[PDB]
RNA sequence: GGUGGCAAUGGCUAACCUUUUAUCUGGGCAGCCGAAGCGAAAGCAACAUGUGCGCAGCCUUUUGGCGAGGCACGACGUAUACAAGUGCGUGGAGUCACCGGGGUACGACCCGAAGCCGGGUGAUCUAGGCGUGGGCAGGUUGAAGCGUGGCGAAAGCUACGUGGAGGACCGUAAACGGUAUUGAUCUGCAAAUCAUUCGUGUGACCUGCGUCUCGUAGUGAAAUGCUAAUCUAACCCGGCAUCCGCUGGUUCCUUCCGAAACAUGUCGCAGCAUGACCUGACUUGAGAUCGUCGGUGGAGUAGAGCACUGAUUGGCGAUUCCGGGGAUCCCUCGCUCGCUUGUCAAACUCCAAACCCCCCGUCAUCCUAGAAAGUCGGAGUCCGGACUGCUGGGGUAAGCUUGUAGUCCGUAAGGGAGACAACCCAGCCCGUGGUUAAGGUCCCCAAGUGUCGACUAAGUGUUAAUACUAAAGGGCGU
RNA sequence: UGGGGCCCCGAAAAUUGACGGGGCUCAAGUCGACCACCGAUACCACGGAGUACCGCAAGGUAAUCUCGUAGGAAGGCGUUGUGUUCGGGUCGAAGCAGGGCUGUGAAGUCCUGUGGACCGUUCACAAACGAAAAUCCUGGUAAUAGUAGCAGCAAAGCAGGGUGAGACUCCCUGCCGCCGAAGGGGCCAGGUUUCCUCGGCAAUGUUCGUCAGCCGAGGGUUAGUCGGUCCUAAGACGUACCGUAAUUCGAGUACGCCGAAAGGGAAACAGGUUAAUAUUCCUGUACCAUUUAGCGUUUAGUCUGACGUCUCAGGGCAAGCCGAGCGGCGUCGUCGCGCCGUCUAAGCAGCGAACCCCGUGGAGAGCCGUAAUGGCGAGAAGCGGGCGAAUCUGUAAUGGCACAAGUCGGCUUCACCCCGGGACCCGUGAAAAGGACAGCUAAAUGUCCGUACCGAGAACUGACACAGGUGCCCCUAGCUGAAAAGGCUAAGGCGUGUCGGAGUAAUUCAGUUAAGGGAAUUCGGCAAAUUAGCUCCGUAACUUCGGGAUAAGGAGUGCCUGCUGUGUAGACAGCAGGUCGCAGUGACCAGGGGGCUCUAACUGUCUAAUACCAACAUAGGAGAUUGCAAACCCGUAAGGGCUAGUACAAUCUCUGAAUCCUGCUCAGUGCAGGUACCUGAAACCCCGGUUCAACGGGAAGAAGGGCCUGUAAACAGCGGGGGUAGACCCUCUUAAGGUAGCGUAGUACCUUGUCGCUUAAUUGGCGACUUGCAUGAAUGGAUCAAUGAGAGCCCUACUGUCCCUAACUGGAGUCCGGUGAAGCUUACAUUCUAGUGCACAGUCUAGAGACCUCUAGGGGGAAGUGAAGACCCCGUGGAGCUUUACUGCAGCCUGUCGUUGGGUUGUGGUUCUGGAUGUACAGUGUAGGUAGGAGGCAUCGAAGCGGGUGCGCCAGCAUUCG
RNA sequence: UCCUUGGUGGGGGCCAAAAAUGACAGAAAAGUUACCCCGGGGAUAAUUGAGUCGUUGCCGGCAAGAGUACAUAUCGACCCGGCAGCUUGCUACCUCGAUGUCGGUUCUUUCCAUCCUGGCCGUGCAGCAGCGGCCAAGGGUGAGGUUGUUCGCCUAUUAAAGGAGAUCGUGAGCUGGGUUUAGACCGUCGUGAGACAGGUCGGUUACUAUCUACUAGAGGUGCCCGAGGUCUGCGGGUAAGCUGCUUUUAGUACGAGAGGAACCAAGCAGCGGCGCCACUGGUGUACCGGUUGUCUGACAAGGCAUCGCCGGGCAGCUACGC
């Protein structure tokens, strides 16, 4: 068994590939509302999410729960957030994306409605909503994907906040070891060609090269699936 | 195999019972082997002796007779199914022990690895992740920002001050690291240390404690590095007395005999099997051939020769033929074919030995104190080497390599060569006396300063074989 | 002239050597012959042993018997026990040491001594039955050897006096030293009695020892306030659930519970006391928590606990320093200096800087602030108030002090406390207990565990009284100085980094110096030397404009006298004059510099223990997958990682900063998409077979494949020969044929390629050329400022690197006392030469040498010692790793069955009503299925007719609306 | 013939024929390891040693001829015969329970096939100087640039700057540049792991001497009236010297000139050897002085910092001196 590749040795749970969950604020997602009910909060704070290095906004809703929410662009301390099938579309404000116009920027967008949010999450990112149909709603992917949604669904109106921060170059190893460090993921990485055979399938030889291929097939098992994995095409666009 | 019991109307019992404490006595016929074979099977199913030779033994007129066992036939059962031949079998000897040998399987004469696999142990070291603490002498540089001021029509350009940034600089024997000396040390202070010299020293920093991640797993800024002095798969115990054709060892005496280092097959080439060769026993019963001489046969090697096959040298004579040289092919001539000359042959032969081989006779030797033959028990051995020949083959040669005959060493003393595995005498029980062998006789050193006839002037030489010994060439040296 | 013998020339090798040596000349050589002798275990003779065969035995025969490895065969000896026979022994068994005799021998027996209770023997039978060997095992014990070590990193002792049997080594005094930002002080982990006292010295202590962390005996640790205990952190554990064949196994969830002697945290101090404990005991003066009783009660949910890195202001203060008084000690040749002390806890009470807040105020052709940033009509300055620190003041003030003084001032202040500001983050820097906000008075209670001592050059760990590590973890006085560097000194700790003496060789470890030369040394300037602090002047190519940079290169520097400026001050900066030395950063400390290349951008990481590199990483660049019930990955499952995440995200790869760029090739392999057609398993269905099946075919046809298309920043590739001043038409093209660049390269075989600079001379370096054996673009190309313990070359400086060594210093060595190992070893051994021999001999052969013992010395030889060669081969020995090797197994893709239901239609017959609808030729009539080969109905029904209801040749059977 | 019996379908068997194992007396079968491990082998290679000598180095015989003529002053064809073992091969006898690699360095020694120095002979030798050969191994044979080199090239000296053997002498002497481990890069090869007889950067050199040998120093015993002194010399050793330059002979002999010697004589030098310390230089931790920092209160006198550092230096030792 030539040993297991860094992708097993995550899927194995061990602390060099976990997350240090104890650093992190909040498990953002919507606030609970039942069906055809509305609930309002009043922004309090603009705090640091060191999960997402991008601010999150702390809410005081009327029912007396307090809630870290994803922050949209503008969102300021003492606005009134409405959650709610007939809540304003406003900047901020989480409602249906069937009750969204179309062009209109949303965020945080639950896969299926009550899912607390999946879609449109980190700094800067949004949505367009492009079309509206009797049971489906199609929205523009910040990866440019066309997703027909349920209109039930419910999304903040705005863009995520943060927008530019991968604008700043790393310009060195630390800095992006500090953002590691709040991460999950392994930093620095070895290439694969600078390991040994029984630590890769790119390892070994006289000379780096990987001998292979480096495009992988979709059927290939774990322990395999390494390099460019299903690509339709390779090299830069001609 | 040796020794016994019983014996075709066969042998023996197993478990078990009888124990009155393992014995023992008496039972115990289940079963096994023998008693009928042949055939895949269905199936079918044989001599209580028909003949001959003949050992022992007995008889005998000493040459014969009878002749168990033995040998050779004949006959029969069955398969080959048509036939014909043949195979196997058939005229009652087995069975159970004791004491042995040997094969096979098991740890299998004893010890000797790396490994493979199971279940467990380990992150007091080290690597990485996380929690919570601690630390970084003293200096240097002087980013943005800010203040005031200069040069400008503006655009803008610009000085100083302030400011205190940076995986910034120097630097500590703080801490961390580990360059070079290839220094000390190298049975050390030390199973990695010391001195000097070096790198980092506000950061991807160093570090305490806590905590987590581990064996086909972990960890790794990746060297197959690290995971408790262990890492290209840790450690403990277990599988395990693993296995090996490979290495080492294997313990008292005498006596008798005494090899093979070879062939064929083998994933065979450091192994094994079968055979040759050694050893033991038995059966059988009259010849055998290591040697000679003569004869009947085989020769195709040596040598020789050119008669075949091919090579090979001139001279001489012809092919009015096939062809090289500058219109009557106007005339010049190489091969080709013969008679003489000169040479050859592993794979040429008109010839043709000496050795040798088969057979017959002969002598010789061995043999009833057991020829030839047969059956069975136990092996070792299949790394060889040497000398003398074969101009052995190959090779420039080789103390090379690979054959062959004889003989040796191996496994061979003693005597002699200076010593000498295998060269000479000699194969050797113990003791004594004698005489020789090889070799030697000036001394070392037992026996010749021996004899005769010559040679050598070079200390040549004083060297059987010899892996241990110099040639071609020359000399009015003698 | 030819043929012969012997000799000569031809004829050169390496330690001194070989006719065996001496030597030998009408021979002691050679040739031809001869004579006598010596000389084996051979041969002969005698005697003896065994063997083979024969013989009833007695014995007979052997010229034709007597070597022997592997090996076969026969007979014996011995050990221990069993059955059995017969014994011996305290008048002395076994065993042991030595000896006599017998036997070929294995062995047996006896004798002497020693020993003190058991031992044999016949015939048989057994076995844990015989040792010289296994780098055999266990034990014991040599040589080495009175040898190495008891030196190198901290060179430490001497005098006098004691104690004692004994003194370098134990104690005291003095002198001389060591560490003095650690070798001192405090304490974690760890140790576990090492602590203290007394008594000892066999061992331990690297020597000694009277000493001791050693040995023996006894003693020693006192808590409401110090910790643990309490809280929670990362993260464990338990129960339950669920999984699992099952569990002590497994993730998650729920509930609990643990997890910090360096995080959070209720509260105590000073002095004294012991031999050893002391915020613990005692004195004095305090404080906290709970329970109870009385006196009163919510403000309730907030705040606090509660937080990063860097930087800076203000205030305070332990330590430190200065002047005066007082009290001691030292010095006292002269002087009047130097040192020590001159003290004082918590608690209690009082004041309160900054920040913040409140009330006034009204500030701009601008004012107010700061170290700095700043602030302001959204309300500055100014003026009042509130809140609110460290610390300071008093009290505690009588305790300790030589019941000696004890009284004052000033300066500074880290490295500690308080407080406030600013900057940075793609990094955001814990939680919970507890506490505060309403408590006051009294009484009672405050259990449990730890507590000695070391905390390391001797108390831990590394086998050690170990130069390592743990821990330099946290602290540290004066001068110099930037300084916690280095040096010299305190305090404190030591002379135990536990052998001494002696002073004399070589050699050696580590240092000092060195004429003249100056890299000639060497692979190479390795090593050493040079420079060195601070101030000022001055500073190049190149550059990413940041830097290069301390570039380079120059000048100054001490002491004394008197001053100037800045500043609140501490101090800092500067000037003038005088003056000494070889030298003023005088010691200590403390860059040598420059030029041209290769390479990697850089800081960083790494082979713990031979590789600190150009390798790894990196930022940057690019590609790939995935819309989240995702991609990727773990698990047998239950369920998980990524993920408290969501495309400017995670994951998977390649390249490796910047700058200029990144060409052509999709034939092969890979990947992706498409699947027209081909291929393609099982099940279902159909056919045949089978009384049923097995089975043989057919149809249909998933994924996969063929096949087509795309894709190179996927893996990769980018070629041979000849006509033309070696370009250009063709080729060979079985995809294309090297673009920009670079080029003898870290790639160039030829090769020390050619030329130029560098040198006297350069297989060198650099530059150019380049026919590139075999360069080339993210298999990244070229290039590059800065950086580099990286690799080469050159200049300068420097030098013992060298010419060529010398002297000197300390430690070893040498010699003496003490202590005291280990490693090679079959034996013998004073060798040397040659030969021989398994062809590399101290031992063999022939010579030559050699009297023995001891000491010192460097290493010629002992093919010296260390290690069953790691190179090579072999083994039907392994291991890891690779792949289009063989064979499998996971994962994944897909068909079928089950899970798995209800409706709607579209596809096959399942099952059958109204008609028997059936008809070459002509029909009166439709075969009314083959037919009793002929024989029934009918005005109570049989037709020629409408689109002709079944149908059809607008005929005619069926009685039908007529 | 198929398990109680009969039958059907389907199986099993007997004899023969066909289908193949070519590694052909018959496995269904690819690599790599320098990250390697284990067992062995001198049964078998790299290296030293032995043998051999094709090849290598050095010669010889006959002399074909060339040499204005003339084989033999000089050169030496064809063929033929050798020596050495210093090149490379061949071989597998020794060694795989290790005989430590290349080159250099240091020190010692040997060979002669002689580079110089000494003596000779010939010449197509006037002299100078050559060319060829003979004897001769006493002494000498050096310094540098490149390269790890050996080898070779080059430089300037030099009388000349010979070659080879000693386990390709010499790692219990040194060095570590090269080769010959593990890391990495480039090129090439390979699908790959990996490889290369290319290149490149980096990469641990163990031991206390038992015996023997040698270098020196002692104690004995032998010899011997006892002791002492002075000698002798069997023997051992030596390189105790070797070699240049200049002057002179002499601008002479010789030679048409140009050029240009030799015997004898002198001095100097290089290297070597032995000794010495008046001189000169070095050292000189005796000693004397100056001075920095600090401590002992100051002065004075002292400690420490490498002898603190700096300057000077007697004796002694020493060479760079004699
Ligand atoms: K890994
Ligand atoms: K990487
Ligand atoms: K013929
Ligand atoms: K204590
Ligand atoms: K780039
Ligand atoms: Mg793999
Ligand atoms: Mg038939
Ligand atoms: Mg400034
Ligand atoms: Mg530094
Ligand atoms: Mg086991
Ligand atoms: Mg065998
Ligand atoms: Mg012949
Ligand atoms: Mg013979
Ligand atoms: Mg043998
Ligand atoms: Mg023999
Ligand atoms: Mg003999
Ligand atoms: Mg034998
Ligand atoms: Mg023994
Ligand atoms: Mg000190
Ligand atoms: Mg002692
Ligand atoms: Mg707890
Ligand atoms: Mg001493
Ligand atoms: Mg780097
Ligand atoms: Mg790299
Ligand atoms: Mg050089
Ligand atoms: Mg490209
Ligand atoms: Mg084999
Ligand atoms: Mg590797
Ligand atoms: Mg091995
Ligand atoms: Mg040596």
């Known amino acids: 068994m030539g040993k297991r590749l860094i992708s097993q040795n995550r899927g194995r ?8 969950s104890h650093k992190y604020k909040a498990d953002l997602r919507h606030p609970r509302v039942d069906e055809n009910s509305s609930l309002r909060g009043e922004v309090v704070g603009i705090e640091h999410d060191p999960a997402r290095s991008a601010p999150i906004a702390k809410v005081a809703f009327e029912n007396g729960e307090e809630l870290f929410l994803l922050a949209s662009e503008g969102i300021a301390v ?9 809540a304003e579309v406003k900047p901020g404000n989480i409602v249906p994306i069937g009750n969204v116009p179309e ?14 949010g999946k ?5 800067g990112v949004y949505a367009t909503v492009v079309t509206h149909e009797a049971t489906r709603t199609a929205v523009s992917m910040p990866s440019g994907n066309i997703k027909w949604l349920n209109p ?19 310009l060195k190893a630390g800095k992006k070891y500090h953002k590691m460090k709040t991460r999950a993921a392994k930093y620095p ?32 098992p774990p322990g395999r699936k390494v390099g460019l994995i299903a690509a339709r095409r390779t090299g830069m666009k001609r």
């Open 189 to 220: 990485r070895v290439s694969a060609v600078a390991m040994n055979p029984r630590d890769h399938p790119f390892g070994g030889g006289a000379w780096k090269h990987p001998g292979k291929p480096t495009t992988v097939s979709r059927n290939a």
């Open 78 to 86: 003492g606005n009134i957030i409405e959650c709610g099938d007939d």
């Open 152 to 170: 039930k669904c419910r999304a903040v109106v705005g863009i995520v906040a943060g927008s530019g921060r991968v604008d700043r170059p790393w």
């Open 13 to 20: 749970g061990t602390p060099t590939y976990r997350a240090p």
């Open 119 to 123: 879609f449109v999450r980190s700094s």
């Open 103 to 116: 062009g209109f920027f949303i965020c945080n967008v639950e896969s299926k409605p009550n899912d607390g």
